[PDB]
Design a binder for these strands. Structure first.
Ligand SMILES: [Mg+2]
Ligand SMILES: [Mg+2]
Length: 861
RNA sequence: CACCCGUGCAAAAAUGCAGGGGUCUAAAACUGAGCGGAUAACCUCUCUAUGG
RNA sequence: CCAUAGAGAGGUUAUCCGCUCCA
């Protein structure tokens, strides 16, 4: 929407007395355009300008650019920020007024410019996007313990890298009671049958078989994840504050375990590439007679794994099926080998366009870049496809007639020896030459969904690209880039970016272990709610009897083998079994308002499909009628009678989707408050250095927002009222406003230290939705996930504060929370006060409508 | 539809207009041609399992 | 033999995140 950004004005920096401007270069690169010194402009980039200045004024610059459509826009002078209607030109400061402190921390001294602060804030944001995912992985691992009752377990909380497994093993005969339980929890964790759900991190493939890793390696993985969560959320004093940025000093055991876990896919991709694609390689070698097979395998590797020339500027898939349309290859005979035939045809087209038809590819991309309507694009594709078919008909037929029958088997067993030294110089780098930060990121991604795997890496790509662009900009201007010894990790930001993009080239979701079907069957029974009178030591025997494991399902066993054949292998069940406690997600599925409201986010196509598969007329009554089908699903104990069974068998996928969506987005909601508390700790640490008496944050979490606001606690409560002088003497720019200072003070006067402490503990340990089955029991309506999550956490707080002394404000809040079966809109802003020093974050995390980026709504005062 | 900042005009403190903000929040960037990952329907084959 | 379910292969249509090239 910003016409200034549309016209190409990437940034407006301000260093010293001058002001520099930049434009959008190639991708995320920034290129200087011109500099301003007191309404006098000296242009830069004379060779290829991006925009020109029409009139330059003290309070703004007018530009016109030709990025897309010629649009004229106006920018504002950075030196004039906070210098309007009441020394008129100075470098702007941040909202928190921590710019000098952050600069003196990251770099060796103060800087009289606002370029370094943006890089520092990007570095800070790197930690923000890691705490959300790191505490999410810890949620899954801690939840894999399958605790049935109320669970407050904390295993990874105490884990630290400073001690190795040799010292940890010394706690077996230790005379301290706490260390006994510390070791017993680890023993129970490694003895768990559900570690097979993360076989890529907990299992090693050594006919051979994949077995559980050694205890030392399991402990190292667990300690690494726990310490990453600890460092991401908390802010430790001393050298522990720079653990992620000085992972070089990790112990030998942790280094070796990181190397081993990272080497698992790379060895599977490089060392057995020929063995995995032998049939295709041999067929292509027979086709391309004149080429060298050593170069052919390298080209195939570039086409499949690296995929660096694949961005040819046109859709090879669409080209291939415009070429093959209307021919004999659409028959039902070739679907058994389509997966190889189509890919080999794509490789043939890609090689042709790379080598001999590069000019034709350039002409095609030029024509496509100026295309008007959809009719033109398909016509150009049809013409190119006609040429490609007339050129490659014989080769395609030769491939197709040698891709069936005994020939596939013969080429699948025949040995092929190939000089591979050419392929080595293109193989993706092993763990030997890959940095510990990226290896740790890879290890972390083993414990979360594939969608979050992509999101976590890509955000890191963007952040490191921004860091690199900022660093490059300050080298052109002659500024200082050299970080202090604490943060020297960022000097190699280019190589970290390269390693991260290389990792993203091949990263996939977590992989199960083939010997993990009995546990998944039991888990599916628990999730669907099928119960048996048999004990724990007999249900396993019954599962072994039915499976007789490579499955051998007996005849006419009914739901017993129906589940084993149709619900263990489902992708939805794979997603849900590693996320959410199986014996708990059934009870929360009984919340009719919760399932009814979550069904609104489900696509109107999925809803129609599953309504047509259960009932035999508006969408609202459709959703309502299928919501109670999801809620009260039932089965047997372990015409219409079979019909009501088939209905519940059909509703299984929608049930699993509903549960997974609810749990995932509730954890996403909790991630915001995890980030907020991390920020509170970090900013307390920063303000402590700047010269502000912040007190002890651990005792009272509102100490930051009290010291910044200027108030203090005496006799347990604040004895200071509103006075306009306090607003203007605030430590940061957020609280300089009188009305919001007053509102934050008012909400702060009705909070409790213990309540805020437990809010912090519940947000960090994720207990609010770990005991979701208890805290969701009585809800009248659900309006959004903000409301649902806050109801859950308020119910948890009331449940624990049942017998402890609670003062008038919290008592009134709990009374409201019990009278109305919905979250109390005042309790949230009462216990959200530790974020008051950051007013925008505080308002985002208190009133809904402002909470969600994708769901804007009206804000009430 | 949040917060802050610039300018213009009523006005004694804020409103109305029009803009900017990687240095505000999970939150800087318009269009076309594509690439990778993930999800959700529909069509056609193959392999399943439940039922009449 | 028909109904339903779930997987694998190939396409089609939305959607989100990131990246390359051009204007
Ligand atoms: Mg904690
Ligand atoms: Mg930012």
């Amino acid at each position: 929407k910003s016409m200034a950004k549309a016209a190409g004005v990437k940034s407006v920096f301000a260093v010293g007395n001058t002001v520099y401007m930049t434009s959008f270069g190639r991708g995320n690169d920034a290129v200087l355009e011109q500099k301003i010194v007191d309404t006098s402009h000296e242009p830069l980039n004379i060779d290829d300008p991006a925009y020109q200045l029409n009139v330059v004024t003290m309070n703004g610059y007018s530009v016109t650019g030709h990025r897309g459509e010629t649009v004229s826009a106006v920018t504002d002078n950075p030196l004039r920020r906070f210098n309007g209607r009441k020394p008129e030109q100075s470098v702007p400061t941040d909202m928190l007024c921590l710019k000098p402190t952050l600069e003196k921390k990251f770099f060796g001294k103060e800087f009289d410019d606002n370029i370094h602060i943006q890089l520092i804030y990007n570095i800070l944001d790197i930690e923000k996007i890691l705490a959300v995912y790191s505490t999410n992985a810890i949620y899954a691992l801690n939840n894999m313990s399958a605790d049935e009752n109320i669970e407050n377990s904390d295993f990874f909380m105490k884990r630290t890298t400073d001690e190795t497994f040799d010292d940890f093993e010394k706690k077996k005969e230790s005379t301290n009671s706490r260390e006994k339980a510390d070791f017993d929890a680890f023993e129970k964790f490694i003895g768990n049958y559900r570690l097979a759900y993360f076989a890529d991190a907990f299992y090693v493939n050594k006919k051979a078989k994949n077995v559980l890793r050694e205890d030392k390696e399991l402990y190292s993985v667990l300690t690494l994840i726990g310490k990453l969560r600890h460092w991401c959320v908390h802010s430790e004093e001393g050298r522990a504050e720079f653990w992620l940025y000085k992972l070089d000093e990790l112990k030998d055991d942790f280094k070796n375990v990181l190397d081993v876990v990272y080497n698992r896919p790379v060895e599977e991709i490089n060392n057995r590439f020929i063995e995995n694609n032998k049939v295709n390689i041999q067929i292509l070698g027979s086709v391309y007679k004149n080429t060298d097979i050593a170069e052919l395998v390298r080209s195939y590797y570039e086409f499949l794994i690296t995929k660096k020339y694949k961005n040819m500027g046109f859709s090879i898939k669409k080209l291939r099926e415009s070429m093959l349309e209307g021919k004999g290859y659409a028959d039902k005979e070739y679907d058994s080998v389509r997966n190889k035939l189509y890919q080999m045809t794509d490789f043939i087209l890609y090689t042709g366009y790379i080598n001999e038809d590069s000019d034709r590819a350039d002409d095609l991309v030029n024509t496509l870049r100026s295309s008007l309507k959809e009719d033109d694009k398909t016509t150009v594709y049809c013409k190119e496809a006609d040429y490609l078919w007339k050129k490659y008909r014989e080769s395609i037929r030769e491939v197709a007639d040698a891709l069936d029958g005994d020939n596939i088997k013969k080429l699948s067993k025949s040995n092929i020896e190939i000089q591979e030294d050419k392929l080595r110089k293109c193989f993706i780098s092993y763990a030997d030459s890959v940095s510990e930060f990226t290896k740790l990121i890879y290890l972390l991604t083993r414990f979360l969904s594939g969608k979050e795997i992509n999101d976590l890496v890509t955000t890191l790509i963007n952040k490191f690209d921004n860091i690199r662009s900022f660093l490059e900009i300050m080298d052109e201007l002659g500024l200082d880039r050299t970080f202090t010894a604490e943060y020297s990790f960022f000097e190699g930001s280019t190589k970290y970016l390269a390693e991260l993009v290389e990792l993203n080239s091949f990263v996939k979701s977590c992989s199960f272990d083939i010997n993990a079907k009995r546990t998944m069957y039991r888990d599916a029974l628990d999730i669907l709610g099928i119960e048996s009178d048999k004990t724990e030591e007999d249900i396993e025997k019954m599962i072994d009897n039915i499976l007789q494991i490579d499955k051998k399902l007996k005849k006419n066993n009914g739901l017993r083998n129906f589940i084993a054949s149709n619900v263990i292998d489902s992708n939805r069940f794979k997603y849900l079994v590693r996320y959410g406690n199986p014996k708990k997600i059934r009870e929360t599925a009984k919340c009719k308002p919760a399932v009814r409201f979550v069904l609104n986010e489900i696509p109107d196509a999925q809803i129609e499909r599953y309504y047509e598969a259960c009932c035999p007329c508006s969408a609202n009554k459709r959703r309502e009628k299928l919501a109670d089908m999801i809620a009260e699903i039932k089965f047997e104990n372990f015409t219409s009678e079979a019909e009501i069974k088939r209905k519940n068998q059909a509703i299984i996928r929608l049930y699993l989707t509903v549960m997974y969506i609810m749990l995932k987005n509730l954890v996403n909601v909790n991630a915001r408050y995890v980030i907020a508390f991390h920020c509170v700790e970090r900013d307390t640490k920063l303000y402590a250095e700047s010269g502000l008496e912040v007190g002890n944050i651990e005792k009272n979490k509102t100490n930051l927002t009290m010291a910044v606001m200027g108030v203090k606690l005496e006799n347990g409560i604040i004895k200071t009222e509103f006075d306009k002088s306090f607003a203007e003497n605030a430590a940061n720019r957020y609280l300089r406003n009188a009305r919001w200072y007053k509102l934050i003070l008012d909400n702060l006067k009705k909070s409790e230290r213990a309540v805020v402490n437990e809010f912090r503990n519940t947000v960090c340990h994720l207990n609010a939705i770990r005991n979701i089955n208890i805290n969701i029991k009585e809800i009248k309506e659900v309006e959004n996930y903000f409301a649902l999550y806050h109801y859950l956490i308020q119910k948890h707080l009331e449940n624990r504060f049942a017998d402890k002394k609670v003062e008038r404000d919290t008592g009134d809040f709990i009374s409201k929370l019990e009278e109305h079966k919905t979250y109390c809109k005042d309790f949230v802003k009462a216990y959200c006060t530790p974020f008051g020093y950051n007013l925008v974050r505080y308002k985002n995390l208190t009133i809904d409508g402002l909470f969600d980026k994708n769901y804007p709504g009206k804000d009430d005062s």
